Amino acid sequence: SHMRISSSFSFGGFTFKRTSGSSVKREEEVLTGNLQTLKIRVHEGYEEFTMVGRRATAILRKATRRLIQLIVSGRDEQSIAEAIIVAMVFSQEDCMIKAVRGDLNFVNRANQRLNPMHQLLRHFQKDAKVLFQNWGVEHIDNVMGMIGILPDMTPSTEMSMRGVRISKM
């Protein structure tokens, strides 16, 4: 049932669909720098998702708590950043957890406490500076139709945030 439920869903304003590979679920306690414990539902294994939003789309390959490749197209800098934020949170990477600042106590529109993955999502939806700063950058190859993006959102032909590429298409 875990495979079935995680095959198609909405997260962070994006429709996710699994296109390849599998995972198993498990509950994993993590600790933010503010020493807050979050019990997250972790996907264990290699999978590939497509993400479709209002103003951006992405393709994501990930493994257990590790983003492998992310390609995003968007209408503008804002919508592209938004897609990158959701992918980074969804990746469940340690460096994303470690980018949290302060305590998370987000509530939905009925004033009920949001689940841990949504605590993370809400947090970084407000400001992704620490997230992008701590994610990491790498050298990239020059591939036609693709360009890198730095943590300050400036495009670069030489470097990019780790695993992240922006499609000109």
Residue numbers in the entry: 315 to 483
Task: Provide the publication's sentences verbatim.
Two mutations (P453H and I471T) were introduced because these positions are surface of the protein and far from cap-binding site. These mutations increased the solubility so that the final protein was stable in 50 mM Tris-HCl (pH 8.0), 200 mM NaCl. We collected the native data sets at 2.00 Å resolution with in-house X-ray generator and detector. There was one molecule in an asymmetric unit. This crystal contains large solvent content (70%), and two mutations P453H and I471T located on the solvent accessible surface in the crystal packing. However, compared with the reported structure of PB2 middle domain, in native, one large structural change could be seen: N-terminal region formed one additional α-helix which consists of 315SHMRISS321. The first three residues (315SHM317) are additional residues derived from pET15b vector. The side chain of H316 interacts with S336 and it seems to stabilize this α-helix. On the other hand, by m7GTP soaking, the α-helix deformed to a flexible structure as describe later. The final Rwork (Rfree) of apo and m7GTP-bound form were 18.6% (22.8%) and 17.8% (21.2%), respectively.
